[PDB]
Amino acid sequence: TMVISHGTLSASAEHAAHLRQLLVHIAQATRQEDGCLLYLVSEDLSQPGHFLITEHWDNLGAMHTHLALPGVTQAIDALKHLNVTDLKITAYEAGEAINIMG
Amino acid sequence: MVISHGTLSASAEHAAHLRQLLVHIAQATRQEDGCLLYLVSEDLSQPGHFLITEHWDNLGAMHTHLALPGVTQAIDALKHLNVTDLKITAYEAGEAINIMG
Numbered sequence A: 001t002m003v004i005s006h007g008t009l010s011a012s013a014e015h016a017a018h019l020r021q022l023l024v025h026i027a028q029a030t031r032q033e034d035g036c037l038l039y040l041v042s043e044d045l046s047q048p049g050h051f052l053i054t055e056h057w058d059n060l061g062a063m064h065t066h067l068a069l070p071g072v073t074q075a076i077d078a079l080k081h082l083n084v085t086d087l088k089i090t091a092y093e094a095g096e097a098i099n100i101m102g
Numbered sequence B: 001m002v003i004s005h006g007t008l009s010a011s012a013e014h015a016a017h018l019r020q021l022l023v024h025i026a027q028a029t030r031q032e033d034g035c036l037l038y039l040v041s042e043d044l045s046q047p048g049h050f051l052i053t054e055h056w057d058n059l060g061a062m063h064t065h066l067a068l069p070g071v072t073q074a075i076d077a078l079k080h081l082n083v084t085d086l087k088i089t090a091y092e093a094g095e096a097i098n099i100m101g
Helices: A016-030 A060-067 A070-081 B012-029 B059-066 B069-079
Strands: A003-010 A036-044 A050-057 A088-093 A098-101 B002-009 B035-043 B049-056 B087-092 B097-100
Touching: A003 A060, A003 B002, A003 B097, A016 A036, A016 A050, A016 A070, A036 B049, A050 A060, A050 A088, A050 B035, A050 B049, A060 A088, A098 B002, B002 B059, B012 B035, B012 B049, B012 B069, B049 B059
Parallel strands: none
Antiparallel strands: A003 A050, A003 A088, A036 A050, A036 B035, A088 B097, A098 B087, B002 B049, B002 B087, B035 B049
């Protein structure tokens, strides 16, 4: 069963540029991983400096493998240094795709 | 709940109008019955590419939204901003799995 992850986090004006760079780097690496079907990092049009992490994993096991990687630990550590303290990620098992448009 | 994941993009000529449209639709949609979340965002890895992230309490509430005249109008608006790549996929979501934070 495919799994969808939704994450949000924000940075102060002072650290936003650094966070964007970090997020783009994390996305480039993660997309290469086993079971990673989608990994997008984006910025809220309604709130500058507020970001979203959107992920689709083939299964829970693949996601767990990702979460345990040293690169993930390193990324979390980097956030501490950017005083990014509000990262929250929640995942959900997904049913079959419902094609709404396109 | 039902999660919707939508993607679309625009040329630089039209992107400012697309951003304003997206913000407008999000502000409106958040007030609708059963709308738990409605975020519009821009891909950091790909300027001009947008994501529409929606969480609906139930499938019927999402259907009601999709049927609104305002939605039909927004879709027509996209056409005239030369957006040709709109894709929306929804999924019924299971129970929350806390990952971190």
